[PDB]
């Protein structure tokens, strides 16, 4: 019943997916092994969406792990909840792209592609009905972006019907983690624009800002950031996986949030996110979340929406709401924030509610915004690519691996077309 | 004997049906098991003391239907009536009309056919759905053309949840609303609009409930439907049949969108110190803000009104109140319809659901009026379509399901023709 | 049957109305819950043995209205007749007439309309407010013109707490008083002036109370209104209707500001040594200091007089006392009104409230006189306006609320014309 | 319901605000944490005016703390009732203006202004209806006056509807606490006259005189002074916060006591103020208070009203009074003190009574006076400014921070115009 395949690439993607799997197991009350230990029937009512039955009353996640090095997958296997995965699902190479898109898409990916397509086909056909695919990777690294692009290409030419979303981690503008990250970003975007239905942009610098200021934590770690992204993912999927007073699914979000085929890049946001002390000084009410809902500080995307305009907005809530108040709250947001909202989309706010709240929180919300702020980000990458292409810096690695200057020219042309369309619709 | 067939499409239809059938079962004293003469009009006694509703629940997504299967009324239904899909239209009328509905409409058609074969005095069909929901538009439209072509002149009633101009969940609501309204305009014998924000207001500053959920909205809707059907399910001084509504409130076949109103809407706390008479409740009902459709009727005119008073109300009192309000200038009626009134008195007091916001009272009035102000909203809705079509936004979504760009334009001009018909 | 609708505006209006309603409920034996024929003239019986007053309480601030909600009479008043605002006018007529009143007047209009719809023999309206308070001037005037344009010639009575020449809480009282009097002159049928300092003096010298709170003042005002309304709420030898008040005490439409007086106001210990006679109470009432308006009537003239005796008073005794006092040279009457008297005898002894300053006695008189001394105060009041207008003090406050500087001069000259009309 | 936002600046402002918050919590029956412990329903009837209902029977004050140094706010956190505040509401700088208005308004305020406006907008919108803002600061210091002026300017250009009152502490004429205090006073007054609806002048020397003579205490402390100012503030606000036989609010006081838009400076006064042994030798009657309110000794403004004239007087009372006696008492005050009262304002006395007495005193009174004595204060400041401007003493600090001599000239001209208007209206 609308089963979902989980695929992760690169160290970042694999760690985030691991965190997401622990979060999902916590939500469904599954032990560290896989045995069912839920407290309500609704926990197992849609358990098959992210799990498959196993003899002995066990449950195995519907996940596939992909890498070009056997280290981070080994760490995931040895990490917490390492026994929930069935070992046969793991697939990895032996070379390592080494932060090179050409290596991760044409030389070292051409051999792992067959295995990963075989395993994803096995997962698809062995299930009842595949609603879609959720992917987890980053556009900066080599194997991550290249493998993600290859998989989305093959899946799209294989399943032109099911919708897939990519939780790609945009490279942080504040530090160029990889010197060749503009090239990887450009190529990954040039593939995602056509071969992926929609994307969510998540930045490490915004996560750091939230952890230091909003969460007020002195020692941020990758675990906490992965936890936040996993909470966002679980909140997105809870509408499908749990009953709601106003239910929704992935297709509802795709239809609501996509006004044009190529304008499918979104900003995720979460609330509430309070430190240890402030939790007892906030009335856990819907207004307390709507005041934390529309502002640049709470958006984990490195782009200020106030400069641009919101094309569309979606809000998924979890808990005990009298959502006529939510409706009038969205009306007030439209009223006072009319400047930031687009004009030719009347009532551009979509709202949905899921009954069961996430574990540990009586009530929460999640924000999915399509706006023109990301354009800036995109725009920036453009010139950086140019800044690293006019001098022909680091072109030897890509040129020797089978790429071409015409390939980069076409990718940059399409990228500039995308940013121009975003600016035009402002 | 004089049975009526209920149909519920989409999540809104499913929830409204759950509330309405629990209300009916409470009214007749029907146990959740179905045990315990007019009950024959909605529940088919089969086997031994076991009564099952003549209800069909259909949805493209199995969430709400499964929740019904797990509800307290699980054993009330024989499990074959509940229907589940696999993929929802997802706020896409094209998806619910062409992709999935085209191959699953036959199942519900067979269901309603065998339900009708065991009924000899089938009065008609009540249909519940929402315009904004993709299922509640597409599947409702498709099933409704199937019923029309399979039955011709058989009466059909539509209970549509008209999306509010600003309270609208799906951002693509105008497209689906325009498409489904164009598609069902010809066959729509009598469709009722319901604007959610209006119910929100009426609940908040009359019932004094600060934070209501769809439970209370469904309670009100079930009360409305019970008031409408009490004529068939109970006796009265002047009983009204279902055909009489489409006989009365349809001055011309094109304009068949009457709105509804209820009175009183209060809690017991106010009910202790307030009495009920026909005049007070009737003038409160005629007040524009009490209507659960967001329009001001004073901006337009009135073509017909039908008031159902349930309880113990003297017919002379009803006549006096109606005549006095007719003399009042605050309501203007169209010239060529000087006598457009219908009154139905029923001796059944309105049933109160346990834990319900509504307070049990002796008298109640449900009013159904055809006003011109509704066209206003339609025009506004049509305007919204332009604001969402001049840029061809979301066009690709519907094109992917097999639509044609000419359908949008023809629906727009058709609804423009409907608007200027007023 | 012959109902009357009460309105209270401002804190003074709310307190006075609370005292009046508790006094009437005690008079008719009405419990604070509302349980136990003329009571129908002021309290509607709803449902079974339950009664609710036909009262509306309105204010721009929620303090006093909320306090009433928490009062013992909460079970008496149905909840929504009480009205609350957010921002008070704050001793600013413009604030209470243009800023807040212009959007909340419709609420009280709807309240009084629904009250009048269930009453068929509505005699007229009673209003209680204060000139000094911004609400009690501005919102009073606004609702008053709304009532006048919705009713035309329907009788309306005003109880204005006229600020004293030296006891005035708001330093900007002359501005509000002049503006509201200009606004209310044309449509207020009959306004009664009441001086706080005069009430203080009367209570301290006659009742011998050293430290009375506003509770005692409210008791006196409630007793006055009860004496006025006893004609409608009880039978008498010569009952007097509300229309007769504006028929008698209005020689010309401009001058319609009669003052009131009560007798006797004594303690129980004084009441042991004093036996009541019509002559003694009447001459005590005609004594200038007994009036609750700080003006000497002998400095002017008398245009009309209206005695209201309640209890067991022989009509011959009343006639003898009135004729003898008419023969007295102490009080002078205007030449063109040789016969300007009216006497209303009622068989209901005045009601006594437990803990009340007044002592229960068999006879009581309430006197209403349209004397010429009132203009005196008006002139002084107008003089005050000059002293606060030559320097244009506080002008910016009212300018900020949307006034026009010319309206101040227009009101000043209008009240000068009213003064010189005498 | 007419919620009020509390903002404090500088060491003096923060300490006075802290004392005021303990006084209010005592009045409303709030424990040392924030849990409700009131004895009457009227305590919680208007509790929302100065509090917000946190989750779990908890209340937090509607307060904001602003400073350019992180020290005194730390003392507030560690002081009594330190846990009642919401920790995130605290806003602190890191430089410190150092008794420099230019530093506190142009250099170091330009970065904290964004945060303080953000938090004040948060408090405003999170509430139902904001009646007004009450501030607490001192004009002698640098960060205090500068931050107060910046906040009033931003609020006034943001909310031109809600009245605000400032409890500014006037610099003491008897000692020049800082050599540059005339400059700060002049600039702060020049901003207040245009961007503040009313101001109260409070001087430390007057409080010392009251403590030594009226209160008869051997060792004055800043705690006692802040306690007296807080008692004055609570007496002012008790009309709004508690039911009264003749209710009043901030707008009533503003309208009654402001004859002209620019003549809006006031004198506070409190009664009764007795030593330990005197309480049993004076009856607690209204005349015993009216004899105590009208005298230059009990005015916390360093200027004798007897030299000038009273423009307007407002008197709020608390306790069990038959206030017709208050009326005739005000008549006696008008009669005997006719010389000290203005002539072209008939019945220049406003009176109000609140039912609930302050905690610990069965009956009390508070006095707000607008008179021409404060003129002298302002007048005096002018010469000091001139005496410190002809020699160009300490002009380097303000000149280097972006100010100008023309700015000081305009400020002095406005001050001279204001004092001339006060003198002319005498
Ligand atoms: N008044 C009211 N409206 C409801 C209720 N439940 C659902 N709705 C309406 O349903 C709309 C949401 O779309 P649905 O009708 O549920 O559509 P769906 O069931 O998801 O089917 P698809 O749109 O095809 O996916 C909202 O706009 C609501 O107005 C209810 O209980 N009361
Ligand atoms: N005699 C008497 N007068 C009262 C009483 N209560 C209030 N008042 C009068 O009311 C006046 C105050 O003005 P209000 O009308 O109460 O002002 P408000 O109710 O706050 O309305 P706004 O002025 O608009 O804010 C005082 O001058 C009193 O004379 C009362 O109980 N008895
Ligand atoms: N949020 C989050 N981001 C991470 C985490 N780990 C790495 N990243 C981000 O991922 C990006 C690098 O992606 P990465 O997966 O390491 O590239 P790769 O191609 O897989 O690298 P390799 O396997 O060829 S060696 C960096 O920008 C880094 O910030 C993590 O645990 N959480
Ligand atoms: N009444 C009262 N006045 C105080 C108190 N503390 C300081 N003051 C007064 O405040 C004035 C100084 O203001 P202050 O707040 O110290 O300036 P500042 O600009 O904030 O100083 P800084 O923060 O840059 S270091 C002095 O005149 C002093 O008398 C107090 O606790 N109570």
Coordinates of C-alpha atoms in Angstrom, one line a residue, chain A:
Chain A
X1 CA 0.0 0.0 0.0
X2 CA 1.9 3.0 -1.4
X3 CA 5.2 1.6 -0.2
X4 CA 8.2 3.9 -0.4
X5 CA 11.8 3.0 -1.3
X6 CA 14.6 4.7 0.7
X7 CA 17.9 5.3 -1.1
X8 CA 20.9 7.1 0.4
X9 CA 24.2 8.2 -1.2
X10 CA 27.5 9.5 0.2
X11 CA 28.6 9.7 3.8
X12 CA 26.1 12.6 4.5
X13 CA 23.2 10.8 2.9
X14 CA 23.9 7.5 4.6
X15 CA 24.2 9.2 8.0
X16 CA 21.1 11.2 7.5
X17 CA 19.2 8.1 6.4
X18 CA 20.4 6.2 9.4
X19 CA 19.1 8.9 11.7
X20 CA 15.9 9.0 9.8
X21 CA 15.5 5.2 10.3
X22 CA 16.0 5.5 14.0
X23 CA 13.4 8.3 14.1
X24 CA 10.9 6.2 12.1
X25 CA 11.5 3.2 14.4
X26 CA 10.9 5.4 17.4
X27 CA 7.7 6.7 15.9
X28 CA 6.4 3.2 15.1
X29 CA 7.7 1.8 18.4
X30 CA 10.1 -0.8 16.9
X31 CA 12.9 -2.2 19.0
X32 CA 16.6 -2.0 18.2
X33 CA 16.3 -5.3 16.3
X34 CA 13.1 -5.1 14.3
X35 CA 10.5 -6.8 16.5
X36 CA 7.2 -5.0 16.9
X37 CA 6.6 -3.3 20.3
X38 CA 4.0 -0.7 19.4
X39 CA 1.4 0.7 21.8
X40 CA -1.5 1.3 19.4
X41 CA -3.0 -0.4 16.3
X42 CA -2.4 2.7 14.2
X43 CA 1.3 2.2 14.7
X44 CA 1.1 -1.0 12.7
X45 CA -1.8 0.1 10.5
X46 CA 0.5 1.5 7.8
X47 CA 3.7 -0.1 9.0
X48 CA 4.2 -1.7 5.6
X49 CA 4.8 1.7 4.0
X50 CA 8.3 1.7 5.5
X51 CA 8.8 -1.9 6.4
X52 CA 8.4 -5.4 5.1
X53 CA 7.2 -8.4 7.1
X54 CA 9.8 -11.0 8.1
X55 CA 9.3 -14.5 9.5
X56 CA 9.3 -14.5 13.3
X57 CA 7.3 -11.3 13.6
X58 CA 10.1 -9.1 12.4
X59 CA 10.2 -6.0 10.3
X60 CA 13.0 -4.8 8.0
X61 CA 13.1 -1.3 6.6
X62 CA 12.6 -0.8 2.8
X63 CA 16.0 0.8 2.4
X64 CA 18.9 0.6 0.0
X65 CA 22.3 2.0 0.8
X66 CA 24.8 3.0 -1.9
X67 CA 28.4 4.1 -1.7
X68 CA 31.7 4.0 -3.5
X69 CA 33.7 3.3 -0.4
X70 CA 33.1 0.5 2.2
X71 CA 33.7 2.6 5.2
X72 CA 30.7 4.7 6.1
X73 CA 28.3 1.8 5.3
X74 CA 30.4 -0.3 7.6
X75 CA 30.0 2.4 10.3
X76 CA 26.3 2.4 9.7
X77 CA 26.2 -1.4 10.0
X78 CA 28.2 -1.2 13.3
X79 CA 26.2 1.8 14.5
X80 CA 22.9 1.9 16.4
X81 CA 20.1 0.0 14.9
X82 CA 22.6 -1.9 12.8
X83 CA 20.6 -5.2 13.0
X84 CA 17.4 -3.8 11.6
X85 CA 18.8 -3.7 8.1
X86 CA 18.9 -7.0 6.2
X87 CA 22.6 -7.3 5.2
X88 CA 21.8 -8.3 1.6
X89 CA 20.4 -4.9 0.8
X90 CA 23.8 -3.1 1.3
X91 CA 25.6 -2.3 -1.9
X92 CA 28.9 -0.5 -2.3
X93 CA 31.9 -0.2 -4.6
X94 CA 35.6 -0.3 -3.8
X95 CA 37.1 2.8 -5.5
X96 CA 35.6 6.0 -4.2
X97 CA 34.8 8.9 -6.5
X98 CA 37.0 11.3 -4.4
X99 CA 34.8 14.4 -4.8
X100 CA 34.6 14.1 -8.6
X101 CA 31.3 14.2 -10.4
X102 CA 32.7 12.6 -13.6
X103 CA 34.2 9.8 -11.6
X104 CA 31.0 9.3 -9.7
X105 CA 28.8 9.3 -12.8
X106 CA 30.8 7.9 -15.7
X107 CA 33.8 5.8 -14.5
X108 CA 33.1 4.4 -11.0
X109 CA 29.3 4.6 -11.3
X110 CA 28.9 2.6 -14.5
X111 CA 29.5 -0.6 -12.5
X112 CA 27.5 0.0 -9.4
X113 CA 24.5 1.2 -11.5
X114 CA 23.6 -2.3 -12.5
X115 CA 23.5 -3.6 -9.0
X116 CA 21.6 -0.6 -7.6
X117 CA 19.0 -0.7 -10.3
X118 CA 18.6 -4.5 -9.8
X119 CA 18.0 -4.0 -6.0
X120 CA 15.6 -1.0 -6.5
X121 CA 13.7 -3.1 -9.1
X122 CA 13.6 -6.0 -6.6
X123 CA 12.2 -3.7 -3.9
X124 CA 9.7 -2.1 -6.3
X125 CA 8.3 -5.4 -7.7
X126 CA 8.4 -7.3 -4.4
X127 CA 6.1 -4.6 -2.8
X128 CA 2.4 -4.0 -3.3
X129 CA 2.4 -0.5 -4.9
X130 CA 5.4 1.8 -5.0
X131 CA 4.1 5.4 -4.3
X132 CA 7.5 7.0 -4.9
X133 CA 11.1 7.3 -3.9
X134 CA 12.8 9.4 -1.3
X135 CA 16.5 10.1 -1.7
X136 CA 19.1 11.4 0.6
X137 CA 22.5 12.8 -0.6
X138 CA 24.5 16.0 -1.1
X139 CA 25.4 17.9 -4.2
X140 CA 28.9 18.8 -3.1
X141 CA 30.6 15.5 -2.9
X142 CA 31.6 13.2 -5.8
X143 CA 29.8 9.9 -5.4
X144 CA 26.8 11.6 -3.8
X145 CA 25.7 13.9 -6.6
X146 CA 26.8 11.6 -9.4
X147 CA 25.1 8.5 -8.0
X148 CA 22.0 10.5 -7.3
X149 CA 21.8 11.8 -10.8
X150 CA 22.4 8.4 -12.3
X151 CA 19.7 6.7 -10.2
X152 CA 17.2 9.5 -10.9
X153 CA 17.9 9.1 -14.6
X154 CA 17.4 5.4 -14.7
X155 CA 14.4 5.5 -12.4
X156 CA 12.7 8.2 -14.5
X157 CA 13.3 6.2 -17.7
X158 CA 12.0 3.2 -15.9
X159 CA 9.0 4.6 -13.9
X160 CA 7.7 7.8 -15.6
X161 CA 4.7 7.7 -13.2
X162 CA 5.8 7.6 -9.6
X163 CA 6.9 10.8 -8.0
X164 CA 10.4 11.0 -6.4
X165 CA 11.7 13.7 -4.1
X166 CA 15.4 14.4 -3.3
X167 CA 16.6 15.7 0.0
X168 CA 19.8 17.1 -1.5
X169 CA 22.1 19.0 0.8
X170 CA 23.1 22.2 -1.0
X171 CA 26.7 23.2 -0.6
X172 CA 27.3 25.8 2.1
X173 CA 28.0 29.3 0.6
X174 CA 30.0 30.3 3.6
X175 CA 32.7 27.6 3.1
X176 CA 33.6 25.9 -0.2
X177 CA 34.0 22.5 1.4
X178 CA 35.2 21.1 -1.9
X179 CA 37.1 23.3 -4.3
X180 CA 35.2 21.6 -7.2
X181 CA 31.8 21.9 -5.5
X182 CA 30.4 24.4 -8.0
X183 CA 30.9 21.9 -10.9
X184 CA 29.2 19.1 -8.9
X185 CA 26.4 21.4 -8.0
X186 CA 25.9 22.6 -11.6
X187 CA 25.9 19.1 -13.0
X188 CA 23.6 17.7 -10.2
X189 CA 21.2 20.5 -10.7
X190 CA 21.2 20.1 -14.5
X191 CA 20.2 16.5 -14.0
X192 CA 17.7 17.0 -11.2
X193 CA 15.8 19.7 -13.0
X194 CA 14.5 17.2 -15.6
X195 CA 14.9 13.8 -13.9
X196 CA 13.5 14.7 -10.4
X197 CA 10.0 15.8 -9.7
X198 CA 11.0 18.1 -6.8
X199 CA 13.8 19.0 -4.5
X200 CA 14.3 20.3 -1.0
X201 CA 17.3 22.5 -0.4
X202 CA 19.0 22.1 3.0
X203 CA 22.2 23.9 4.1
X204 CA 24.7 23.1 6.8
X205 CA 25.3 26.8 7.7
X206 CA 21.6 27.3 8.4
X207 CA 21.5 24.2 10.6
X208 CA 24.5 25.6 12.5
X209 CA 22.7 28.9 12.9
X210 CA 19.6 27.2 14.3
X211 CA 21.6 25.0 16.6
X212 CA 23.6 27.9 18.0
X213 CA 20.8 30.4 18.3
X214 CA 17.4 28.8 18.0
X215 CA 18.2 25.6 19.8
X216 CA 20.9 27.3 21.9
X217 CA 23.4 24.5 22.0
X218 CA 27.1 25.1 22.6
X219 CA 28.3 21.9 20.9
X220 CA 26.6 21.2 17.6
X221 CA 27.2 17.8 16.0
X222 CA 26.3 16.2 12.7
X223 CA 24.0 13.9 14.7
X224 CA 21.8 16.8 15.8
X225 CA 21.6 18.2 12.3
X226 CA 20.7 14.8 10.8
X227 CA 18.1 14.5 13.6
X228 CA 16.5 17.8 12.5
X229 CA 16.4 16.8 8.9
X230 CA 15.0 13.4 9.8
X231 CA 12.3 15.1 11.9
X232 CA 11.4 17.2 8.9
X233 CA 11.2 14.1 6.7
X234 CA 9.0 12.2 9.3
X235 CA 6.7 15.2 9.6
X236 CA 6.4 15.4 5.9
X237 CA 5.5 11.7 5.6
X238 CA 3.3 11.4 8.6
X239 CA 0.3 12.6 6.6
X240 CA 0.5 9.5 4.4
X241 CA 1.7 7.1 7.2
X242 CA -0.9 8.2 9.8
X243 CA -4.6 9.1 9.6
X244 CA -5.4 12.8 9.8
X245 CA -8.4 15.0 10.2
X246 CA -7.3 16.5 6.8
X247 CA -5.1 13.8 5.2
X248 CA -2.5 14.4 2.6
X249 CA 0.2 12.5 0.7
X250 CA 3.3 13.1 -1.4
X251 CA 1.2 13.7 -4.6
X252 CA -0.9 16.3 -2.8
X253 CA 2.3 18.2 -1.9
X254 CA 3.7 17.8 -5.4
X255 CA 0.5 19.2 -7.1
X256 CA 0.1 22.0 -4.6
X257 CA 3.7 23.1 -4.5
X258 CA 4.5 22.9 -8.3
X259 CA 3.1 25.6 -10.5
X260 CA 5.5 24.9 -13.3
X261 CA 7.4 21.7 -14.2
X262 CA 10.9 23.2 -13.6
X263 CA 10.0 25.4 -10.6
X264 CA 10.3 22.6 -8.1
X265 CA 12.8 23.6 -5.5
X266 CA 11.6 24.1 -1.9
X267 CA 12.6 25.4 1.5
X268 CA 11.9 23.2 4.5
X269 CA 11.4 24.5 8.0
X270 CA 10.5 23.0 11.4
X271 CA 8.9 24.2 14.6
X272 CA 9.0 24.2 17.6
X273 CA 12.7 24.2 18.2
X274 CA 13.4 25.4 21.8
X275 CA 16.3 25.0 24.1
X276 CA 16.2 23.2 27.4
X277 CA 14.9 26.1 29.5
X278 CA 12.5 27.9 27.1
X279 CA 10.3 24.9 26.8
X280 CA 8.4 25.8 30.0
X281 CA 7.9 29.4 29.0
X282 CA 6.0 28.9 25.7
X283 CA 2.3 28.1 25.4
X284 CA 2.3 25.1 23.0
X285 CA -0.4 26.6 20.9
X286 CA -0.8 27.1 17.1
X287 CA -0.2 30.9 17.3
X288 CA 3.1 30.1 19.1
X289 CA 4.1 28.1 16.0
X290 CA 2.8 30.5 13.4
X291 CA 4.9 33.2 15.0
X292 CA 7.8 30.8 14.6
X293 CA 6.6 29.8 11.1
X294 CA 7.2 32.6 8.6
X295 CA 10.7 34.1 9.1
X296 CA 14.1 33.7 7.6
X297 CA 15.8 32.6 10.8
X298 CA 13.8 29.4 11.0
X299 CA 14.3 28.4 7.3
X300 CA 17.1 25.9 7.0
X301 CA 17.8 27.2 3.4
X302 CA 20.5 29.8 2.9
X303 CA 18.2 32.3 1.2
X304 CA 16.2 35.1 2.8
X305 CA 12.6 34.9 1.6
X306 CA 12.0 38.6 2.4
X307 CA 14.1 39.7 -0.6
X308 CA 12.0 37.5 -2.9
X309 CA 8.4 36.4 -2.9
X310 CA 6.7 33.2 -1.8
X311 CA 5.2 31.5 -4.9
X312 CA 3.5 28.9 -2.7
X313 CA 3.5 27.7 0.9
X314 CA 2.5 24.4 2.5
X315 CA 2.1 23.7 6.2
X316 CA 1.7 20.2 7.8
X317 CA 0.8 20.1 11.5
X318 CA 0.8 17.3 14.0
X319 CA -1.1 17.0 17.2
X320 CA -4.4 18.3 18.6
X321 CA -5.6 21.4 16.7
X322 CA -9.0 23.0 16.1
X323 CA -7.8 23.9 12.7
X324 CA -10.4 26.5 11.9
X325 CA -7.9 28.5 14.0
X326 CA -5.2 27.3 11.6
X327 CA -7.3 28.5 8.7
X328 CA -7.8 32.0 10.1
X329 CA -4.2 32.1 11.0
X330 CA -3.2 31.4 7.4
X331 CA -5.7 34.2 6.5
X332 CA -3.9 36.6 8.9
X333 CA -0.5 35.6 7.5
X334 CA -1.8 36.4 4.0
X335 CA -3.2 39.7 5.3
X336 CA -0.2 41.2 7.1
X337 CA 2.5 39.5 5.0
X338 CA 0.9 40.4 1.7
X339 CA 4.2 41.9 0.5
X340 CA 6.1 38.6 0.6
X341 CA 3.3 36.6 -1.1
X342 CA 2.8 36.4 -4.8
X343 CA -0.3 38.1 -6.2
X344 CA -1.4 35.9 -9.1
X345 CA -1.9 32.9 -6.9
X346 CA -5.0 33.6 -4.7
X347 CA -4.9 31.8 -1.3
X348 CA -1.4 30.4 -2.0
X349 CA -1.3 28.6 1.4
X350 CA -2.0 24.9 1.7
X351 CA -2.7 23.3 5.1
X352 CA -2.9 19.7 6.3
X353 CA -3.1 18.1 9.7
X354 CA -2.1 14.7 11.0
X355 CA -3.6 13.3 14.2
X356 CA -0.6 11.6 15.7
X357 CA 2.1 14.0 17.0
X358 CA 5.8 13.1 16.8
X359 CA 7.2 11.3 19.9
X360 CA 8.2 13.7 22.7
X361 CA 6.2 16.6 21.3
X362 CA 2.5 17.1 21.8
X363 CA 2.2 19.3 18.7
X364 CA 4.5 20.5 16.0
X365 CA 4.4 21.9 12.4
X366 CA 6.5 21.8 9.2
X367 CA 6.9 24.3 6.4
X368 CA 7.5 23.7 2.7
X369 CA 7.9 26.9 0.8
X370 CA 8.4 27.5 -2.9
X371 CA 9.8 31.0 -3.3
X372 CA 12.3 33.1 -5.3
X373 CA 14.9 33.4 -2.5
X374 CA 16.7 30.2 -3.6
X375 CA 17.3 32.0 -6.9
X376 CA 20.0 34.1 -5.2
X377 CA 21.6 30.9 -4.0
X378 CA 21.3 29.5 -7.6
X379 CA 22.4 32.8 -9.1
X380 CA 25.5 32.8 -6.8
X381 CA 26.6 29.3 -7.9
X382 CA 26.4 30.5 -11.5
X383 CA 29.1 33.1 -11.2
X384 CA 31.2 30.9 -9.0
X385 CA 31.1 28.3 -11.7
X386 CA 32.1 31.0 -14.2
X387 CA 34.8 32.2 -11.7
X388 CA 36.2 28.7 -11.8
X389 CA 35.7 28.1 -15.5
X390 CA 37.2 31.1 -17.3
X391 CA 40.6 30.2 -15.9
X392 CA 39.9 26.5 -16.7
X393 CA 40.8 25.5 -13.1
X394 CA 40.5 21.8 -12.2
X395 CA 39.2 20.9 -15.7
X396 CA 41.8 18.2 -16.2
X397 CA 40.1 15.7 -13.9
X398 CA 36.7 16.0 -15.6
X399 CA 38.1 16.2 -19.1
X400 CA 40.2 13.0 -18.6
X401 CA 37.2 11.1 -17.3
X402 CA 35.1 11.5 -20.4
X403 CA 33.3 14.8 -20.0
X404 CA 33.7 17.8 -22.3
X405 CA 33.7 21.6 -22.2
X406 CA 30.5 21.5 -24.3
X407 CA 28.9 19.5 -21.5
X408 CA 29.7 22.3 -18.9
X409 CA 28.6 24.9 -21.4
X410 CA 25.2 23.3 -21.8
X411 CA 24.8 22.7 -18.1
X412 CA 25.6 26.3 -17.4
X413 CA 23.2 27.5 -20.1
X414 CA 20.4 25.5 -18.6
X415 CA 21.3 26.7 -15.1
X416 CA 21.2 30.3 -16.3
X417 CA 17.8 29.6 -18.0
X418 CA 16.5 28.3 -14.7
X419 CA 17.6 31.3 -12.7
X420 CA 16.3 33.7 -15.4
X421 CA 12.9 32.0 -15.3
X422 CA 12.9 32.4 -11.5
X423 CA 13.7 36.0 -11.8
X424 CA 11.1 36.6 -14.5
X425 CA 8.3 35.1 -12.4
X426 CA 9.1 37.6 -9.7

